[model samples]
Target: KKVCACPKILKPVCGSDGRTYANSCIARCNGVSIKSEGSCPTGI
Candidate 1:
């Protein structure tokens, strides 16, 4: 079985596809690559 980082409602990140995911683990699970360490930029 695989263990995810388990988001603790902290460190929200932005995916390259321009979506704001809860965290990196959840983002990768959704097939989205990270673009930055914060929410997606405005008007992305």
Candidate 2:
């Protein structure tokens, strides 16, 4: 396991996993690919 101290700034990004990640660093932490540079849409 590698230690990564990513910034804790709120840079919302939508992940392909249908979740709104705080930032790309968080997405990578969860192994989720980003779909767009914003919060995930509210699903119907």
Candidate 3:
């Protein structure tokens, strides 16, 4: 099986609640799910 995990680097991602996280792991750690990549949408 593959070990799914986020890298320890600047990998910005957008959370479902419209927030920009440092990375997937960071977001997941904070109980947030990724909605998209490269920051959240405008007016969020």
Candidate 4:
């Protein structure tokens, strides 16, 4: 799958306690796991 907006998916990537998930987005393939439920600012 594809969701590569030039590493702009989840920009805020501060780890080790300082938590942030910026604009989290993901998609994959070759043994897929793209199962999503609904309810949000918008739902896919």
**Among all candidates shown, the one with the greatest lDDT:** 2
lDDT of 3 by residue, 1-44 (tens): 74435566687756688888786766765677674446532222
TM-scores for the candidates = 0.49, 0.54, 0.53, 0.18
Q: Write the per-residue lDDT of candidate 4 for residues 1-44, one digit (tens) a residue.
A: 74344334353434334454453232221222223324112233
Clash-forming residue pairs, model 3: none
- lDDT tens readout by residue for model 1, 1-44: 95554556665766687767776767766667675436432221
- Report the alpha-carbon TM-score of model 2 versus the true structure: 0.54
Per-residue lDDT for 1-44 in model 2, tens only?
A: 76656676787865686777677776766677665535443222
Better of 2 and 3 by lDDT: 2
TM-score: the better of candidates 1 and 3: 3
| lDDT ranking, high to low | 2, 3, 1, 4
Lowest lDDT 10-residue stretch of candidate 2:
35-44
Residue 15, model 2: lDDT of: 65
Local accuracy by lDDT, each model: 0.59, 0.63, 0.62, 0.33
Q: Using TM-score, rank the candidates from best to worst.
A: 2, 3, 1, 4
Candidate 1 error regions (>4 Å): 1-9, 35-44
Better of 2 and 4 by TM-score: 2
Off by over 4 Å in 2: 35-44
